[PDB]
Design a protein around this ligand. Structure first.
Ligand SMILES: [Mg+2]
Ligand SMILES: [Mg+2]
Ligand SMILES: [Mg+2]
Ligand SMILES: [Mg+2]
Ligand SMILES: [Mg+2]
Ligand SMILES: [Mg+2]
Ligand SMILES: [Mg+2]
Ligand SMILES: [Zn+2]
Lengths: 37, 177, 174
RNA sequence: UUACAAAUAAGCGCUCUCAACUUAAUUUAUGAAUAAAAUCUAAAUAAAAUAUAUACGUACACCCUCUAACCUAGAGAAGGUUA
RNA sequence: CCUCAUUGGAUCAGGACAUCCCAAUGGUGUAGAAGCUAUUAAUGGUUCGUUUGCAACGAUUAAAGUCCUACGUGAUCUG
């Protein structure tokens, strides 16, 4: 989880969610792909 | 008319006992009503020097309602006066600790910022639930309309009313529902 | 009533005799204090409602004293209860099952070896004291040019707030 | 132990120190929008999870005679004691 | 053609969090152990000396944080 200003998907498996007031890209295959706004 | 000087003066400047019900009412619309009665601003004989305020009794203060997310966003801040003595507590947390606090603070801010405000607060009586002392009941003279119209829940809607409202659309039979 | 979990029973008022050494079967030495239960009676009972707490209250009293330099009020309180006046009253929080009738004496056997206890009493008075002995402030050097400042408080506070915070530690009665 | 070549005071001596209702990052379970045998939910929900804190405790609680004396109480006053 | 002039310490510290240690976590080119990076959190703590006039070292520590308060603080003291 890196807190970045812009959230961008990095692979096909990456998906987006809106949890606890923020946007997350969560990837099960590659956990490196996780970003928080 | 035709009253003696003494009873006439007593009748005019007598103080009245009122009842508010806070069930599902926003605290700040209750304060507007309560603050007006407390100052005596509802009387044509009102004067700032006349001590013409009235008693206001509010019940069900535990069941007040906040619009929006004010329960979590509105914060009450206090200081004991000692280093490290600053506390900020949200509306929800303050409500849990003290059921009557939020309404009392809302009314307090509305009153004039002068010495008489503290006397007015003595006239205010807040009970978290409908329970009232026996003596307080006898004093009450008049009830007051609630400021906010309380929307009905689905269960409250009558069977006839549901029929009266039209079915805008019909589900297809090929649906699990 | 029988004991149920969460119960709190009465306590005693005792006089402090002194200290003495004590040993365990392991050879360790433990300094111990001697407390004497002396004319301890239950004096007054309140119910949960009047005390305003969740729990009820029992007032106990020990160390009977003379009757000759006491206010009429205190003497009447004891005459109703049929006891000689006591030196001190204290309040104990007791659950309903553990209530004891007023006028009931209490004895050291109320406690048994192996239980842990809490004692509260007024500390020895030290009179008006300085800041070194009251709060353990370091103070200032003896020599090397220190002029009339050895045991004094240093700077009270900062220059900005232009006042002294409430609760600042200062010389006072200790 | 060091003093007063006093009945005391000190530390270099001795004893005692605890509960968390209430959250954030984060992690789960159930499940719609969204045909999933999806989805932790600024959807309705169920849980776990720092530091904080006072909801919850302990302490205090008495309306109090005073010539005077005495006091491990004290600058004074206050306070304690008086077959 | 040349140039150049408030701040240490002692005492007592209040506060910020842009966290030095303590605590809860995500990721890893994380086997374990050591580490690296980021989120969260201001909780209590954050040593003693030597040469020094600014640094330069010694021995420790879970750590020896970074800053604001008119060198924070001279009707408290001191170079
Ligand atoms: Mg010294
Ligand atoms: Mg001197
Ligand atoms: Mg000021
Ligand atoms: Mg500080
Ligand atoms: Mg932070
Ligand atoms: Mg000054
Ligand atoms: Mg002076
Ligand atoms: Zn990915």
């Amino acid at each position: 989880f890196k807190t970045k200003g812009v959230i961008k998907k990095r692979c096909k498996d990456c998906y987006k969610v809106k949890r606890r007031g923020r946007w997350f890209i969560l990837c099960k295959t590659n956990p490196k792909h996780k970003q928080r706004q | 008319s035709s009253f003696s000087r003494a009873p006439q003066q007593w009748a005019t400047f007598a103080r009245m006992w009122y009842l508010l019900d806070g069930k599902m009412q926003p605290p700040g619309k209750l304060a507007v009503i309560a603050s007006n009665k407390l100052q005596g601003l509802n009387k044509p004989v009102y004067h700032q020097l006349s001590d013409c305020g009235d008693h206001v009794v509010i019940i069900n203060t535990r069941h007040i309602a906040f619009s929006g997310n004010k329960w979590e966003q509105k914060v009450y801040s206090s200081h004991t006066g000692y280093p490290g003595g600053f506390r900020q507590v949200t509306a929800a947390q303050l409500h849990r600790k003290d059921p009557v606090a939020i309404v009392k603070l809302a009314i307090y801010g509305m009153l004039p910022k002068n010495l008489h405000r503290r006397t007015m607060m003595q006239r205010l009586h807040l009970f978290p639930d409908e329970d009232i002392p026996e003596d307080i009941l006898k004093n009450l003279v008049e009830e007051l309309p609630q400021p906010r119209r309380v929307p009905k829940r689905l269960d409250e809607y009558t069977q006839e009313e549901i029929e009266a409202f039209p079915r805008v659309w019909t589900p297809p039979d090929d649906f699990r529902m | 009533h029988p004991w149920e979990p969460g119960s709190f029973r009465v306590g005693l008022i005792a006089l402090k005799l002194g200290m003495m050494p004590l040993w365990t079967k392991d050879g360790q030495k433990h300094a111990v204090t001697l407390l004497q239960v002396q004319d301890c009676h239950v004096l007054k009972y309140t119910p949960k409602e009047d005390h305003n707490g969740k729990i009820a209250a029992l007032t106990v009293g020990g160390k009977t004293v003379s009757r000759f330099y006491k206010p009429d009020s205190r003497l009447e309180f004891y005459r109703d209860l049929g006891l000689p006046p006591k030196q001190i009253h204290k309040i104990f929080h007791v659950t309903d099952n553990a209530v004891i009738k007023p006028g009931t004496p209490l004895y050291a056997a109320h406690f048994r070896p192996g239980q842990y206890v809490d004692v509260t009493a007024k500390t020895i008075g030290k009179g008006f004291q300085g800041v070194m002995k009251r709060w353990g402030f370091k103070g200032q050097p003896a020599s090397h040019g220190q002029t009339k400042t050895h045991r004094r408080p240093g700077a009270i506070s900062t220059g900005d707030i232009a006042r002294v915070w409430p609760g600042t530690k200062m010389p006072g009665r200790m």
